[PDB]
């Protein structure tokens, strides 16, 4: 998310 992480695996 905004201010954080977005992980696609």
Numbering used by the authors: 209 to 217
Paper text:
The result showed that segment 209GFGGNDNFG217 (named hnRAC1), but not the others, formed hydrogel at 4 °C. The hydrogel was composed of amyloid fibrils observed by TEM. As temperature increased to 25 °C, the fibrils disassociated spontaneously, resembling the behavior of full-length hnRNPA1. To reveal the structural basis underlying the reversible amyloid formation of hnRAC1, we determined the atomic structure of hnRAC1 in the fibrillar form to the resolution of 1.0 Å by micro-electron diffraction (micro-ED) and to 1.4 Å by micro-focus X-ray diffraction. HnRAC1 formed needle-like crystals that diffracted both electron and X-ray beams well. The structure revealed a cross-β architecture (or steric zipper) with hydrophilic sheet interface composed by N213 and N215. Moreover, the hnRAC1 structure exhibits a distinct feature of negatively charged D214 continuously stacking along the parallel in-register β-sheets. Stacking-D engenders instability to the fibril architecture due to electrostatic repulsion and hence is barely seen in pathological fibrils. Note that in the local chemical environment of the hnRAC1 crystal, D214 is in contact with the amino terminus of hnRAC1. In contrast, as we mutated D214 to V or N, although the resulted peptides still formed amyloid fibrils with no profound structural change, unlike the WT fibril, the mutant fibrils were stable and did not dissociate as temperature increased. Similarly, in the hnRAC1 structure, kink at G211 enables the aromatic ring of F210 to reach out and interact with the Phe residues from neighboring molecules via π–π stacking.
Extensive studies have identified that many RNA-binding proteins, such as FUS, hnRNPA1, and TDP43, largely contribute to this conditional cellular compartmentation. These proteins commonly contain low complexity (LC) domains that can drive the full-length proteins to undergo liquid–liquid phase separation (LLPS) via weak multivalent interactions. In this work, we directly visualize temperature-sensitive amyloid fibrils in the liquid-like droplets of hnRNPA1 by transmission electron microscopy (TEM). Our work bridges the liquid phase and solid phase of hnRNPA1 and illuminates the functional role of reversible amyloids in the assembly of stress granules and the pathological risk as intermediates en route to irreversible fibrils.
